[PDB]
Amino acid sequence: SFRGAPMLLAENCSPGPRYSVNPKILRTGKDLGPAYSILGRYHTKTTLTPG
Amino acid sequence: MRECISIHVGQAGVQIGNACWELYCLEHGIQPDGQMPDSFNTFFSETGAGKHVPRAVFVDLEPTVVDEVRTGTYRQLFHPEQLITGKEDAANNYARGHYTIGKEIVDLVLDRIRKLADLCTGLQGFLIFHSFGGGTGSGFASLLMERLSVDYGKKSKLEFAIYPAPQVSTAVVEPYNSILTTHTTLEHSDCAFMVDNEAIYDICRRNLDIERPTYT
Numbered sequence: 059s060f061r062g063a064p065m066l067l068a069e070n071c072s073p074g075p076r077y078s079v080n081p082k083i084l085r086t087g088k089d090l091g092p093a094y095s096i097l098g099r100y101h102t103k104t105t106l107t108p109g
Numbered sequence: 110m111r112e113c114i115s116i117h118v119g120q121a122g123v124q125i126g127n128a129c130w131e132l133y134c135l136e137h138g139i140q141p142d143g144q145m146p147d148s149f150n151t152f153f154s155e156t157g158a159g160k161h162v163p164r165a166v167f168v169d170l171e172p173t174v175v176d177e178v179r180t181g182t183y184r185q186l187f188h189p190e191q192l193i194t195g196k197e198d199a200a201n202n203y204a205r206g207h208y209t210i211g212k213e214i215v216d217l218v219l220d221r222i223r224k225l226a227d228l229c230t231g232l233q234g235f236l237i238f239h240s241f242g243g244g245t246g247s248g249f250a251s252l253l254m255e256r257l258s259v260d261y262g263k264k265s266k267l268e269f270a271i272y273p274a275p276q277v278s279t280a281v282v283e284p285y286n287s288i289l290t291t292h293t294t295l296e297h298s299d300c301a302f303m304v305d306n307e308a309i310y311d312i313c314r315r316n317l318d319i320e321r322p323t324y325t
């Protein structure tokens with residue numbers, strides 16, 4: 059008679075490459091990045107000892 | 110086809126994955142280098158240079174318990190990308206490492222899941238060792254189950270969970286962070302087995318003959 063069923067296919071589990079990544083979480087965690095803010099000039103007031 | 114992937118959340122999760130993986134490495138001979146001095150393919154991805162890579166998942170939020178295993182006696186064997194931890198420890202809190210920063214790192218943990226499991230055919234199940242009483246292995250474990258229930262489909266997942274028994278309680282927030290994860294694991298788990306640190310205690314007392322043990 060006529061012979062084989064050819065068959066095909068596999069399983070696959072994960073959702074392909076459909077998950078973004080840019081969290082900067084360097085394996086053990088989001089490591090670093092320091093943020094320095096501009097400051098001002100410290101001053102004071104005056105007095106009157108004599109004249 | 111017989112491959113199983115482990116997931117291990119919490120400080121408890123990594124230090125009870127470590128001893129279990131030591132037993133795994135002893136049950137069929139692989140050196141801590143990760144070389145030869147059907148049992149191999151389920152957990153160890155064979156390389157073109159004879160190396161064996163454990164296909165686990167070790168995830169945390171406190172680096173000081175996972176930084177040790179990348180500087181310990183097994184640091185040759187474990188892949189560095191898989192040993193994930195965080196910057197801030199959740200510290201008995203559900204929501205930091207679920208909404209603010211663990212929202213940001215579940216992205217990379219799921220990327221590592223996708224990168225690890227792509228070279229397999231027979232993913233037969235997942236193994237999760239979660240912390241009911243902790244902060245990391247409660248909240249991040251919960252987020253893992255919420256994403257894994259909908260993205261992997263109807264894949265089997267199993268819980269060898271830990272459960273702070275009412276007699277011996279380490280922290281006081283065991284009715285405070287475990288109830289919400291019990292609600293999570295009710296609808297997003299298939300088999301869940303509880304362990305406690307009181308039954309092991311008296312079997313080590315009378316059935317075993319070792320006094321003053323550690324968690325190790």
Ligand SMILES: Nc1nc2c(ncn2[C@@H]2O[C@H](COP(=O)(O)OP(=O)(O)OP(=O)(O)O)[C@@H](O)[C@H]2O)c(=O)[nH]1
Pocket residue numbers: 118119120121122124125170171198199200201202240242243244245246271272273278279280304305306324325
């Ligand atoms: N059964 C068992 N329980 C453990 C073990 N080690 C720690 N625990 C439990 O874990 C709890 C400690 O909190 P962790 O699970 O470590 O929480 P964490 O991973 O540090 O994350 P945070 O809570 O945010 O700090 C304790 O209440 C213990 O009961 C262990 O080796 N075996």
Ligand SMILES: [Mg+2]
Pocket residue numbers: 119120169170171198199243244245246
């Ligand atoms: Mg922790």
